[PDB]
Design an enzyme around this catalytic site. Structure first.
Site, PDB file in Angstrom:
ATOM      1  N   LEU A   1       0.811  -1.224   0.000  1.00 50.13           N
ATOM      2  CA  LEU A   1       0.000   0.000   0.000  1.00 50.13           C
ATOM      3  C   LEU A   1       0.841   1.269   0.000  1.00 50.13           C
ATOM      4  O   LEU A   1       2.018   1.243  -0.366  1.00 50.13           O
ATOM      5  CB  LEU A   1      -0.926   0.026   1.219  1.00 50.13           C
ATOM      6  CG  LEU A   1      -2.070  -0.978   1.313  1.00 50.13           C
ATOM      7  CD1 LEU A   1      -2.724  -0.895   2.682  1.00 50.13           C
ATOM      8  CD2 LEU A   1      -3.084  -0.707   0.218  1.00 50.13           C
ATOM      9  N   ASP A   2       0.194   2.386   0.345  1.00 54.08           N
ATOM     10  CA  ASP A   2       0.917   3.597   0.715  1.00 54.08           C
ATOM     11  C   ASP A   2       1.895   3.302   1.845  1.00 54.08           C
ATOM     12  O   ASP A   2       3.109   3.481   1.699  1.00 54.08           O
ATOM     13  CB  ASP A   2      -0.075   4.688   1.123  1.00 54.08           C
ATOM     14  CG  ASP A   2       0.547   6.071   1.165  1.00 54.08           C
ATOM     15  OD1 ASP A   2       1.744   6.216   0.847  1.00 54.08           O
ATOM     16  OD2 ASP A   2      -0.176   7.024   1.525  1.00 54.08           O
ATOM     17  N   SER A   3       1.383   2.816   2.973  1.00 61.69           N
ATOM     18  CA  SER A   3       2.232   2.245   4.002  1.00 61.69           C
ATOM     19  C   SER A   3       2.619   0.824   3.599  1.00 61.69           C
ATOM     20  O   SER A   3       2.080   0.260   2.645  1.00 61.69           O
ATOM     21  CB  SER A   3       1.528   2.264   5.359  1.00 61.69           C
ATOM     22  OG  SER A   3       0.411   1.393   5.371  1.00 61.69           O
ATOM     23  N   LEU A   4       3.617   0.267   4.293  1.00 58.63           N
ATOM     24  CA  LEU A   4       4.082  -1.118   4.176  1.00 58.63           C
ATOM     25  C   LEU A   4       4.636  -1.498   2.802  1.00 58.63           C
ATOM     26  O   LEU A   4       4.924  -2.672   2.554  1.00 58.63           O
ATOM     27  CB  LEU A   4       2.980  -2.106   4.572  1.00 58.63           C
TER      28      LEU A   4
ATOM     29  N   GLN B   1       6.751   1.223   1.674  1.00 56.97           N
ATOM     30  CA  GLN B   1       7.685   2.341   1.725  1.00 56.97           C
ATOM     31  C   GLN B   1       8.667   2.156   2.876  1.00 56.97           C
ATOM     32  O   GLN B   1       9.849   2.473   2.727  1.00 56.97           O
ATOM     33  CB  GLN B   1       6.888   3.640   1.842  1.00 56.97           C
ATOM     34  CG  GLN B   1       7.704   4.903   1.922  1.00 56.97           C
ATOM     35  CD  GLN B   1       6.828   6.137   1.904  1.00 56.97           C
ATOM     36  OE1 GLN B   1       5.606   6.038   1.799  1.00 56.97           O
ATOM     37  NE2 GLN B   1       7.445   7.309   2.013  1.00 56.97           N
TER      38      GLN B   1
END
Ligand SMILES: CCCCCCCCCCCCCCCCCC(=O)OC[C@H](COP(=O)([O-])OCC(O)COP(=O)([O-])OC[C@@H](COC(=O)CCCCCCCCCCCCCCCCC)OC(=O)CCCCCCCCCCCCCCCCC)OC(=O)CCCCCCCCCCCCCCCCC
Ligand SMILES: CCCCCCCCCCCCCCCCCC(=O)OC[C@H](COP(=O)(O)OCCN)OC(=O)CCCCCCCCCCCCCCCCC
Lengths: 68, 458, 107, 51, 84, 275, 57, 167, 173, 114, 141, 86, 55, 55
Positions: free
Chosen positions: L40-43, L45
């Protein structure tokens, strides 16, 4: 190979200094060192009791030491 | 002094008589030669007493104190040459001659044979010091500080003349300290308070109490070329010793009113060293160290009965050598960074390794590491005022606590790094910078072997 | 300490004793006391808290420590016998609260 | 060698420091202040038990 | 100040001699021979006299009849002692 | 055979009545402790020959460690309370030059500032009892103090107890040790195993012919020794450095050894440090 | 560097020098031989005890 | 600090303070997606208080139970032996004054010293010329053009270009 | 050297040994070797100086002073005779410091020579020394006029209080 | 315990146009880095944040000062304050200590020092 | 040598927007929480109009601080607020103001009631009453 | 005392691509740019270096996130930090 | 090693006139000295090898 | 302690997987004494009581 070049700031002036302490301290220290060595061997003081000094006593040099 | 004054005046028509730039080497050459002659006839014996020649000398018999006065003219000329060498030779000849002219009157002082010969020589200074304060400083607040140096010293010293002339026509004549065998005692009255008080207060204005110290971080903060009279002004402060000559006799039995001088100078001791840990001017950091453990002698003189005079004499020339060198540590390391702000001089201890020892062996004499001339001085004062009252170990013990955290705060500000700036600060502490930083610890730890030379009568 | 009489010499450090100071002494069985020789107890350089009972057996015990110099044990069984001198001394002292609990009761 | 490195270190000062010691007990009115022998009754006395 | 020469005090020459007038005169004659001078300086404050003179005078009093540490009022009955 | 020797070497200054020259002492703690402590220091430099193998500043560390031993060893040999005070504060300044071995690292020399700080609070008790000995007994040579045991020693020894807690890491002065370990390893291998923390209890050991009386002394000392046990116990659990775990365990061994003076066992106390 | 006599690893267990284990196993034997005088012969408390001194009358 | 990367700086430490709490290795690793499962609850929604209650209640149960003396990665802002290499500390350009016979050693390093200074001594006709132009008046962070449009020299020359190496 | 009456000690009393065993003693290896290694560079060199120092001799004499005036002389406004009475007096106080130094070292003599008992034995020191120091600060120590050292201006007047207050005003002694 | 120290708070959108306070410090840093890099400086930069830090702390407190308050007249509770108290202690000793020294004795026979 | 805006003046209401910043950029446009109003405690000569005090405090946080340096080593341009007490500051801990440390020594303060008793090993508490008799009851026989 | 070269950093970064089960050994070597398969956006990056958080993991500050998109730009300044290749 | 130092002192506090909270503080501390031992065993000398690589 | 440390260390290892439970009172490992006093005694003397009776 594992190698680099270190950076040490300044040591020449500190090696140009520390001589002049150690040079000149022997220039009159070591000639004074025999004067505490050789004068011990040949010269002392003695002893006690008393002497009666004759009639008039000695002057200065009442002390018991070579150079004193 | 038979003739110590007579060669040291002959130094004066040698400087202007000389050639060009030879004037530095000609003066420092002969000035060292007195140090044999100063030692030479003096340090004799010794059991009641050495009256020396005449009405001009009692030889400074039981308080030597005078050999240290003669180091300095061949100690300051090698120190002052850092930023002086831009002026004219006609003024460079001046600044050497008035400095000798300050040593002339100090030589007949400390010996002085009298009490009225003392005063006129006690006040014969303060004219050649004031010339070194006003001319040859830095940016302003010289001129008010030139006036704060007066008007404390001179306002107090004029009621000496009212009392010393009063003694001279009351009981015989004061002209000798050895005609002081006949001494009538001084009882409790309302006029004998003031006779004690006016005779004492002019000495308090030089060796300060906690009050009236307001001139001491004025003249030392804004100060000549490289501590050049600041070395002299630390001797001159401890050259107000003459309370040892007066108050031992000459109203001996007034301890009744010692107490506003005790408590003011015993609680002030624990505070005026505490008020310096937030200093930001480096030369004002040392200037309050000189307040604190100088004022320990004021509770060591007024409390009589030796085992204190063992120590109160050793403390006059304890920081005679220490606080001189600390000013020399700060008269150096200002030629390279042009501020006395203690923040700015960081990034050090890598750039100048050879002078790291000169910081520590200075600041290891305030921690004072008992085999020196320092904790042979304090531990006689401690064991003296213990026998006054037991409670005085508390304040004097916390005096020992805070000055431990105080001295290291000046060391540890140089043990940092990365220096951020400073394309300057290159000069790797040249041969002069270590020479005039030496001859301080070289007699300071030497005399710890046989310090029977440093003792009163006692 | 079994006697409470006067002391002739004014020598402190309780060697001025009746003969020898016990811990309590004697008290009942035996009501007596005694020890070694006080002229030898001062001739032997020996500290206090060592002039109690079983000292003469110990003065002969520790002598063999030097009389057998490069040794590991002068007499290990006598150390168990000096302890047997000590344990018989101490259990003789342990009968206080066997008595004092009962002898303080009514009769 | 282990010959001139070891002999120079220790053997020379013991010659020196003894010379300020034997010439010193007869000069200063107190030498080293040695204690007594701490002797048990095994010289001229009884034992006497083990009773 | 470095034109890569060494420099001691002021400049190149006879200012070079300024080191050997401060090093040789300052210490190495005064801090050695003058330090030697008061190392063995004679009997200071007349205590060396008093060492042997207190050493002698003990055993003479200790011999026959004279006690030690009198504080005997410095030959009394020369004091008239005014009562009141 | 015994034959203990003090000496009389060489005169310092001598003032009104008390002469101090210097001497040495050779009774049960000189002829026993010295080869023990020196055998460790023989063994510890070989580590630092390999631990400090890469440092170009090598020679100071084998010089400052040498001066540290001399002023540590001058303490136990002294029969003079002035000679103790030399070795008491010679070892203190050797800490500042060894905790702050590495420059920079603004927690390192701040801990060195904390190191010399708690020694000066630990100073103020020792100079108190130094003062009390002149005013009564005209001297402080340890022979003449043990001639007549002083009657009311309530004043000097509580000062001697506070100076004992200065270096021996008791409660109230405990946080000096766990942040003094921030230097190199053979520093703290020598600074807290054999030296500088067993010296604080060592001064009380030498004063056994005074401390046996005066029941205000013993109950305060043994209760002080008990508090240092569990406060160093319940601080060492859930702790995440090897050196810190050793830093508390060297402090909790003291908590036995402080009690060993309270219960009058002087030689059992000293025999623990030899082990 | 100069000598790679102990190589770095990627968790493959670099071993010993086949002589360190000899000195290692030698100093477990010297201590469990030293349990000799712990039991043979040394007991818990070689003092003797009291058999409850109640009959003191 | 944007709301996009507001969770992310908290997300790096949410697992980082967790691994100082475990004792096994799999104890952390079995809890990996388990810790991710609560973080994967609100996936894609608004940016207002509708989704700020993920963060406005993340103060509890993160600050509550936050790292009882955690692992510190010893070369860091904190932690032991981080800024320790300072007895050497690389005092770069301390080579000004020597009084030679001390400039005898390294004849090639002093040869190469005078070569690199031409970029240092002569870049001000070019780099400072555009520096009044590229910076309009007083704008934000003062990096130059990243090639400086012909040759980046540097602007950070040479104190950031030849800086101190660690050892 | 000195005289042993000033610095007393009992005889040494080193006993007879008791080896009693064939266990290996290292004392025969120690004293029978190392005494000779020091005997050559010490005894031969000390004797070599001892003749070289007996080549010539040097003299220094006893220094005994003249004591004609003592205490209560003279009249008040005099200077000269009241200078001699202080030169008399100060020598009678530097000396009386050191007699306390001698008796104190006598106390150091017994206690390291006995050590173990040290209290009930030697019988003399704690009786002698505290009859000398208690005879010190009375009349010979200006407490607290010790600062100026007050020669004959106060050294008589503790001893005036030891006559004008003492021995008559005790009511009635 | 000294202090809270407020390490998280709220925003968005309380006064969102507050930005370019960095434009002050970027202007200073663009002024500083252009000052700091140069081929021939040989000396420090002035940086008058230090100059206004000493001179507004060393001087410029007494030309500022007016005694209009009583919190600057508070110093009689701090200056002459404890100095009153140290006199009260020291004359109770050396008087109670004095009478015991004259009437009766307290010290022993071996008190030569003192 | 800078004379214009050398230091403060007798403030702190001398048109505060002219102060920060003529020079001494404590505030941007006199609304920055550091406009030179903060003379807190007027009548004291300390801290006049003063691009200076009661500004936010307690630390240079002595960490990353990575524009380049930003805290205490590396010297940013104009950020001195009050110093010489920020040489080694800290921050908030995991708890706050639950003084269990005085409560930690309170455990022995309760055990000071155990200092009143003794610790004799033989025997135990012995629940008899006045039959313990710790020293003596009767005579020798 | 142990040195290092630049051929080891090219492998470890490449290996933990294969160690992740989300990413196959069919993506590009040095530049897949992490958006090729982001999410996702997180995890995607910070989790992408959470494996090297344990292995290299020298506390990896806040600037390291958006530079790490280019998977060669990770390899660029690891050599700058830990005093690496020539 | 120190069995002749440790055991002989805790059994010198056996018969004593102590605080009676002292033996309730010394002997309890001995039990806490045991978990000092296995802690460095159970983390450095027991578990599975976990640390960053290049052994 | 050999039983007690292991059955807690194995409870830290092979138990029923205790939660990462935030609820612990840890004034245990911190001591809580250096946290308050070295944040008070260098602030009490060096800031208030030094700017009081200095300038
Ligand atoms: C191959 C070389 C050629 C041959 C060389 C000659 C052979 C060697 C010489 C023989 C040995 C002499 C050496 C003297 C030092 C040792 C003397 C000794 O231990 O016995 C005491 C001995 C006593 O003689 P005595 O007959 O037993 O009694 C007479 C006195 O009454 C005794 O009482 P006192 O009045 O002396 O009082 C004691 C005290 C009093 O003296 C002092 O305290 C003065 C020192 C401080 C001065 C402070 C005032 C300054 C203002 O003395 C001391 O301080 C002793 C400390 C060591 C000497 C201090 C040196 C002073 C500098 O000698 C002295 O005290 C005089 C010392 C004079 C020093 C001479 C300078 C020597 C410098 C040599 C430099 C060598 C450098 C080598 C380089 C090494 C590289 C690694
Ligand atoms: C304040 C001013 C008050 C001074 C009052 C004068 C004191 C006085 O009267 O002198 C007393 C006395 C001689 O006076 P008299 O009483 O006549 O003696 C008897 C003659 N058969 O004995 C004297 O001769 C004392 C003379 C010396 C004292 C004069 C100086 C007193 C003031 C100095 C105070 C300390 C410094 C303060 C000033 C500096 C700051 C401004």
């Amino acid at each position: 190979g594992k190698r680099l070049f270190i950076i040490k700031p300044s040591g020449f002036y500190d090696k140009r200094f520390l001589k002049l302490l150690r040079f000149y301290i022997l220039l009159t220290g070591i000639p004074v060192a025999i004067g505490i060595t050789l004068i011990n061997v040949f010269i002392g003081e003695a002893e006690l009791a008393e002497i009666p000094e004759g009639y008039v006593p000695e002057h200065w040099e009442y002390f018991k030491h070579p150079i004193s | 002094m038979l003739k110590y004054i007579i060669p040291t005046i002959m130094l004066m028509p040698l400087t202007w008589l000389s050639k060009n730039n030879m004037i530095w080497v000609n003066s420092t050459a002969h000035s060292l030669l007195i140090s044999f002659t100063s030692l030479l006839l003096m340090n004799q014996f010794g059991d009641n007493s050495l009256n020396f020649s005449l009405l001009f000398f009692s030889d400074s018999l039981s308080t030597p104190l005078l050999i240290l006065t003669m180091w300095l003219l061949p100690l300051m000329l090698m120190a002052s040459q850092h930023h002086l060498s831009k002026e004219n030779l006609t003024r460079k000849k001046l600044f050497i001659t008035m400095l000798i002219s300050l040593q002339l009157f100090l030589i007949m002082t400390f010996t002085a044979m009298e009490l009225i010969l003392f005063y006129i020589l006690f006040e014969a200074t303060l004219v050649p010091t004031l010339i070194i304060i006003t001319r040859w400083g830095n940016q302003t607040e010289r001129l008010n500080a030139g006036l704060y140096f007066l008007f404390y010293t001179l306002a107090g010293s004029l009621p000496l003349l009212v009392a010393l002339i009063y003694i001279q026509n009351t009981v015989g004549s004061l002209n000798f300290l050895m005609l002081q065998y006949w001494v009538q005692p001084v009882h409790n009255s309302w006029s004998n308070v003031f006779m004690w008080l006016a005779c004492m207060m002019a000495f308090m204005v030089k060796m300060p109490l906690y009050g009236l110290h307001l001139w001491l971080p004025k003249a030392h903060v804004e100060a000549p070329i490289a501590g050049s009279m600041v070395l002299a002004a630390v001797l001159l402060k401890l050259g107000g010793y003459g309370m040892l000559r007066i108050t031992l006799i000459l109203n001996p039995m007034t301890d009744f009113m010692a107490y506003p001088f005790i408590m003011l100078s015993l609680w002030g001791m624990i505070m005026t060293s505490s008020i310096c840990l937030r200093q930001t001017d480096l030369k004002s950091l040392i200037a309050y160290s000189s307040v604190s453990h100088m004022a320990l002698v004021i509770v060591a003189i007024l409390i009589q009965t030796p085992w204190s005079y063992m120590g109160a004499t050793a403390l006059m020339i304890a920081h005679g050598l220490t606080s001189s060198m600390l000013f020399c540590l700060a008269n150096s390391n200002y030629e390279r960074i042009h501020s006395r702000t203690m923040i700015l001089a960081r990034g050090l201890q890598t750039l100048l390794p050879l002078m790291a020892t000169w910081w520590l062996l200075a600041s290891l004499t305030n921690l004072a590491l008992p085999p020196t001339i320092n904790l042979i001085g304090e531990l006689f004062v401690v064991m003296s005022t213990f026998s006054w009252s037991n409670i005085t170990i508390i304040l004097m013990g916390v005096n020992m606590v805070i000055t431990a955290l105080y001295s290291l705060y000046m060391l540890i500000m140089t043990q940092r790094g990365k220096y951020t700036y400073h394309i300057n600060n290159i000069s790797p502490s040249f041969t002069r910078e270590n020479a005039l930083m030496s001859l301080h610890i070289l007699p300071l730890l030497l005399l710890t072997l046989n310090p029977k030379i440093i003792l009163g009568p006692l | 300490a079994r006697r409470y009489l006067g002391d002739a010499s004014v020598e402190p450090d309780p060697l001025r004793m009746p003969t020898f100071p016990p811990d309590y002494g004697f008290p009942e069985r035996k009501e007596r006391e005694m020890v070694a020789t006080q002229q030898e107890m001062n001739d032997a350089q020996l500290v206090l808290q060592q002039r109690d009972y079983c000292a003469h057996y110990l003065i002969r015990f520790l002598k063999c420590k030097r009389d057998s110099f490069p040794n590991f044990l002068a007499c290990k069984h006598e150390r168990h016998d000096w302890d047997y001198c000590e344990h018989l001394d101490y259990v003789k002292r342990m009968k206080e609260f066997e008595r004092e609990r009962r002898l303080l009761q009514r009769k | 060698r282990h010959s001139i490195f070891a002999f120079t270190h220790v053997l020379i000062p013991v010659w020196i420091i003894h010379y300020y010691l034997k010439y010193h007990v007869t000069t200063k009115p107190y030498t080293i202040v040695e204690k007594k022998p701490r002797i048990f009754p095994g010289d001229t006395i009884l034992e006497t038990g083990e009773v | 100040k470095n034109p890569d020469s060494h420099g001691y005090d002021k400049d190149p020459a006879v200012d070079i001699w300024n080191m050997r007038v401060v090093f040789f005169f300052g210490f190495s004659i005064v801090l050695v021979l003058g330090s030697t001078f008061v190392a063995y300086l004679p009997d200071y404050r007349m205590q060396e006299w008093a060492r042997r003179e207190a050493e002698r005078l003990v055993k003479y009093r200790e011999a026959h009849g004279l006690p030690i540490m009198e504080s005997n009022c410095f030959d009394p009955s020369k004091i008239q002692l005014p009562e009141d | 055979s015994g034959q203990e020797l003090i000496i009389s070497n060489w005169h310092w200054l001598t003032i009104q009545t008390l002469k101090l020259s210097l001497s040495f002492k050779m009774d049960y703690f000189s002829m026993m402790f010295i080869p023990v402590a020196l055998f460790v220091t023989w063994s510890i430099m070989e580590f630092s020959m390999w631990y400090m193998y890469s440092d170009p500043n090598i020679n100071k560390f084998f010089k400052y460690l040498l001066l540290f031993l001399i002023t540590m060893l001058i303490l136990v040999t002294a029969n003079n309370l002035f000679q103790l005070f030399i070795g008491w504060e010679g070892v203190g300044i050797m800490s500042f030059l060894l905790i702050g071995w590495w420059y920079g690292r603004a927690d390192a020399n701040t801990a060195a500032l904390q190191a010399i700080l708690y020694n000066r609070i630990g100073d103020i008790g020792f100079i108190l009892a130094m003062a009390w000995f002149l005013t009564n007994l005209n001297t402080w040579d340890l022979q003449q103090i043990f001639m007549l045991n002083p009657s009311d020693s309530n004043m000097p020894l509580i000062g001697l107890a506070l100076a004992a807690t200065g270096k021996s890491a008791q409660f109230g002065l405990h946080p000096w040790l766990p942040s003094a370990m921030e230097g190199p390893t053979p520093v703290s291998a020598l600074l807290h195993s054999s030296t500088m923390v067993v010296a604080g209890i060592f001064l009380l050991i030498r004063f056994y012919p005074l401390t046996e009386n005066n029941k205000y002394i013993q109950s305060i000392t043994l209760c002080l020794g008990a508090i240092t046990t569990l406060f160093t116990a319940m601080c060492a659990l859930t702790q995440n450095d090897i050196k810190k775990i050793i830093a508390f365990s060297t402090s909790s061994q003291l908590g036995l050894m402080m009690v060993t003076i309270g219960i009058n066992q002087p030689y059992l106390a000293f025999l623990h440090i030899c082990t | 560097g100069g000598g790679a006599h102990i190589e770095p690893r990627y968790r493959q267990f670099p071993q010993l020098t086949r002589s360190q284990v000899i000195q290692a196993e030698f100093f477990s034997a010297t201590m469990w031989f030293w349990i000799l005088w712990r039991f043979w012969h040394d007991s818990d408390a070689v003092l003797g005890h009291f058999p409850y001194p109640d009959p003191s009358q | 600090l944007t709301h996009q990367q507001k969770v992310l700086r908290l997300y790096k430490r949410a697992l980082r303070h967790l691994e100082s709490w475990c004792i096994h290795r799999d104890k952390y690793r079995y809890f990996a997606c388990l810790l991710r499962a609560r973080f994967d609850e609100h996936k894609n929604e608004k940016d207002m208080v509708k989704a700020t209650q993920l963060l406005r209640e993340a103060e509890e149960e993160f600050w509550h139970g936050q790292h009882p003396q955690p692992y510190i990665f010893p070369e860091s802002p904190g932690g032991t032996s981080y800024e320790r290499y300072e007895c050497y500390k690389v005092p770069e350009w301390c080579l000004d004054d020597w009084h030679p016979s001390e400039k005898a050693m390294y004849p090639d390093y002093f040869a190469k010293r005078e070569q690199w200074k031409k970029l240092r001594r002569e870049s001000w006709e070019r780099e400072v010329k555009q520096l009044q132009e590229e910076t309009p008046v007083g704008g934000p962070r003062t990096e130059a053009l990243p090639p400086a449009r012909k040759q980046g020299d540097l602007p950070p020359l040479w104190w950031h270009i030849v800086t101190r190496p660690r050892e | 050297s000195w005289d042993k009456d000033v610095y007393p000690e009992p005889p040494r009393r080193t006993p007879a040994p008791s080896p009693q065993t064939s266990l290996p003693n290292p004392i025969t290896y120690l004293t029978k070797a190392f005494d000779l290694l020091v005997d050559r560079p010490v005894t031969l060199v000390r004797e070599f100086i001892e003749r070289q120092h007996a080549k010539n001799k040097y003299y220094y004499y006893h220094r005994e002073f003249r004591r004609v005036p003592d205490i209560t002389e003279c009249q008040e406004k005099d200077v000269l005779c009241m200078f001699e009475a202080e030169m008399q007096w100060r020598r009678d106080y530097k000396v009386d410091q050191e007699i306390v130094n001698i008796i104190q070292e006598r106390l150091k003599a017994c206690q390291q020579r006995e050590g173990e008992s040290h209290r009930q034995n030697c019988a003399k020191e704690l009786e002698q020394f505290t009859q000398v120091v208690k005879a010190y600060q009375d009349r010979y120590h200006d407490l607290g006029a010790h600062y100026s050292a007050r020669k004959c201006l106060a050294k008589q007047k503790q001893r005036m209080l030891a006559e004008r207050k003492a021995a008559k005003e005790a009511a009635a002694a | 315990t000294t202090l809270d120290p407020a390490e998280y708070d709220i925003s968005s959108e309380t006064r969102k146009a507050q930005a370019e306070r960095l434009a002050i410090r970027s202007r200073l840093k663009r002024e500083y880095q252009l000052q700091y890099y140069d081929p021939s400086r040989r000396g420090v930069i002035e940086d008058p944040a230090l100059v206004r830090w000493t001179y507004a702390r060393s001087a410029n407190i007494y030309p500022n000062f007016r005694p209009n308050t009583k919190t600057s007249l508070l110093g009689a509770l701090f200056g002459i304050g404890p100095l009153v108290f140290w006199y009260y202690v020291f004359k109770t000793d050396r008087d109670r200590k004095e009478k015991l020294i004259q009437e009766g004795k307290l010290d022993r026979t071996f008190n030569i020092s003192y | 040598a800078s004379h214009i805006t050398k230091d403060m003046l007798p403030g702190p209401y001398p048109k505060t927007p002219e102060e920060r910043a003529a020079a001494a950029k404590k505030y941007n446009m006199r609304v920055e929480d550091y406009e030179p109003y903060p003379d807190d405690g007027t009548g004291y000569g300390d801290y006049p109009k003063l691009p200076d005090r009661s500004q936010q405090e307690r630390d240079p946080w002595y960490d990353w601080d990575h524009p380049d340096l930003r805290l205490n080593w590396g010297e940013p341009m104009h950020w001195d607020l009050d110093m010489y007490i920020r040489n080694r500051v800290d921050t908030s801990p995991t708890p706050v103001n639950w003084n269990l440390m005085c409560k930690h020594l309170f455990g022995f303060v309760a055990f000071m009631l155990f200092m009143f008793w003794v610790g004799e090993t033989y025997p135990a508490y012995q629940p008899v009453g006045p039959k313990q008799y710790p020293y003596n009851n009767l005579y020798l026989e | 005392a142990p040195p290092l070269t630049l051929e080891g950093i090219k492998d470890r970064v490449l290996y933990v691509l294969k160690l992740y089960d989300k990413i196959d050994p069919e993506k590009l070597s040095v530049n897949s740019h992490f958006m090729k398969d982001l999410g996702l956006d997180s995890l995607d990056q910070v989790e992408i270096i959470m494996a090297m958080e344990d292995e290299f993991g020298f506390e990896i500050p806040d600037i390291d996130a958006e530079k790490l998109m280019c998977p060669q730009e990770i390899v660029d300044y690891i050599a700058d930090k830990k005093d690496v290749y020539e | 090693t120190g069995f002749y130092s440790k055991d002989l002192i805790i059994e010198a506090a056996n018969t004593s006139y102590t605080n009676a909270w002292a033996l309730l503080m010394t002997l309890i501390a001995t039990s806490f000295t045991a978990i000092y031992s296995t802690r460095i065993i159970f983390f450095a000398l027991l578990g599975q090898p976990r640390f960053p690589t290049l052994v | 302690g050999f039983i007690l440390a292991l059955e807690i260390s194995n409870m830290t290892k092979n138990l029923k997987y205790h939660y990462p439970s935030n609820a612990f009172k840890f004034s245990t490992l911190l001591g809580y004494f250096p946290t308050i006093m070295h944040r008070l005694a260098p602030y009490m003397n060096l800031s208030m009581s030094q700017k009081s009776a200095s300038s």
